[model samples]
Target: TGVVPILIELDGDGHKFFVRGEGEGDATIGKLSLKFIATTGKLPVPWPTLVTTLVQAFSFFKSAMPEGYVQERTIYFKDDGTYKTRAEVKFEGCTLVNRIELKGFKENILGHKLEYNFNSHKVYIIKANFTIRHNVEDGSVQLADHYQQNTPIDHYLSTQTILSKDLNEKRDHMVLLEYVTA
Candidate 1:
């Protein structure tokens, strides 16, 4: 159940870009990254709507290869001079079922905690720390022993979803993520 990194190269109308994945990359990441570059004036598209169209192109390759696919590379220059010859990005892998479940658990627990704290003391909950460790052979998630302030909740959630056999067998790659607060 080891993970494999895959790369997809896109080329059209003399423009070239690449999407690489640590295990099986998601088209969503490709679309979002392209949007970022386009919005920043790095890529020349006639209108922002064109970015949506370009994102759909990923769907074509999505059906062609489930594990991974490439969009055939060609030469194109970057407008921002960031890459004189081409653009390439290491995209994150598609979120696995287990990872999503773990995230849901985190959100559920945190949400309850926030509500409790708020009602009891008018505490303005800012953020909570969460971390997931994965078993290399099965890609199952585990609660780190070092979790801060919510070890009991984390442990129960992890056991219910992340460590369950149903999820462990469904996915084979670990997801790396950073929680952001706004």
Candidate 2:
């Protein structure tokens, strides 16, 4: 089993939760909500370390393949021919939500799978959950011939007004949440 924390930013209203290492290791899979004032800018008590795990995990999974290995999946790249950052996401309305599931081979012997669910139910807000599992003893995941699979399961919850904002803002703040790791 794997553990991950949920974070929310309400229209730059100021509410965030970050758990890392033992802090992240100790959490149970569930839902977390934050209520804060707009523009108050009060940081969450738990800090940014908690949320860093997800960021690291994503980075790790992005390049898990062995050198010279022919990737089976057709990974999309930017017009500049660079890997897309995790923050390159599109939100349809006030509440932008997406779920991602990834599965891959480990060292040509073991298999791993993970799931992430997120929702932006308000202005500048986000709520997320992640689950991960290793299947060394089960057949659902196979480890032979240097194989791996990264499946991203994305689902859109509700359709609403499209708000044009800086995707970089949220993404950069998220990276800051992970800076404690370095």
Candidate 3:
């Protein structure tokens, strides 16, 4: 029952940090907007540690590509109550920017929380985000039952529709995102 299952990789060492879901979050993506949340496993760390890691992840994206970019994945849901992982799409050298806000201080920590605005060029990928998409198929990438593959966004107001006799729902799932319209 994994939703988005958010994981963050801040350094080149390949260490992946999980950002589990807190309550309710949505992960919506499109040609213009990129935002969503997931409903999956819980993050093991405390709030402070998660926040710090997110800030670092933001920095990582900044350093990797100043203009920033994002790569999304293709998915299809079958009427037989199944789905498939397809292709990878990317938006590169985006002028529009985004991260999760950080006001750092006693108050920013104790008195308030954080949210990502589309214009902020900020981002936050809680493990919940991973759980949501993955919730479909446990976001699974397997077959021979090994650490086999990695599963990987968005457009329009197209919501999930009713599957016909043999038709399934096919849509793009956002994988790694940073670009936000400014």
Candidate 4:
């Protein structure tokens, strides 16, 4: 037979066991001690499998950003000379809260400190306090107003409302939520 030979030796009390190759220059890679297994009644997990499982679990836990993360967007009117206005809009933590500040207009500087939840789908105004600045040659002054009496001023329509009709019967309006890149 061409089978490799191994020699096993046991102690006198039969509590310990040793295994070795039966040829010269033989080496021992590892040892399996029965005493440990008998004490714990279980074998330890292999190192490779344990390490891989740990790495996978850790990666799963390190997930990406939450769905409610904040995102900033710049809103501008369409270029068809319809509604000339520009503003900076920012979504606060994926909630209905939003902040808007008017820009690009020189004669009237409008600042909406808090414009809560107005979009193309739904038009809602909540606690919106805005200030309008009148620019003059000598100096400028600001006029502030609030929707105190629950007046639904159609705030959403003010931005995207059709200002005029063209000769071709096509309606022209401002396009809010203009797309931009980083």
Tens-place lDDT per residue, model 1, 48-154, is: 11111121112122243233222211111111111111222223464321110000012212222111010001112212233323222233222221112111001
| Per-residue lDDT of model 4, residues 1-182, tens digit only | 12122221111111222111111111131111111111222112111111100100010101321211221222221221111111111222432111111112221222222222121112233233332222223344323221211111133212211111124422211111211111
Clashing pairs in 4: none
Candidate 1: lDDT of 118?
8
Model 3 segments more than 4 A misplaced? 1-38, 55-64, 67-182
Q: What 10-residue stretch in candidate 1 is worst by lDDT?
A: 114-123
User: All candidates' lDDT scores?
Assistant: 0.21, 0.22, 0.22, 0.18
Candidate 2 minimal-lDDT segment of 10 residues: 76-85
**CA shift at 6, candidate 3, in angstroms?**
14
Whole-model alpha-carbon lDDT for candidate 2: 0.22
With candidate 2 superimposed using the best TM-score fit, by how many Å does residue 82's alpha carbon deviate from the native? Answer: 37
lDDT of model number 4 = 0.18
Candidate 3 local lDDT, 5-55, one digit each (tens): 232222101122322221111223311212222222222212322221221
- Candidate 1: list runs displaced more than 4 Å: 1-54, 57-60, 73-92, 95-182
Best of the two (2, 4) by lDDT: 2
Once model 4 is optimally superposed onto the true structure by TM-score, how far is the C-alpha of residue 26 displaced, in angstroms? 96
**Cα-lDDT of candidate 1:** 0.21
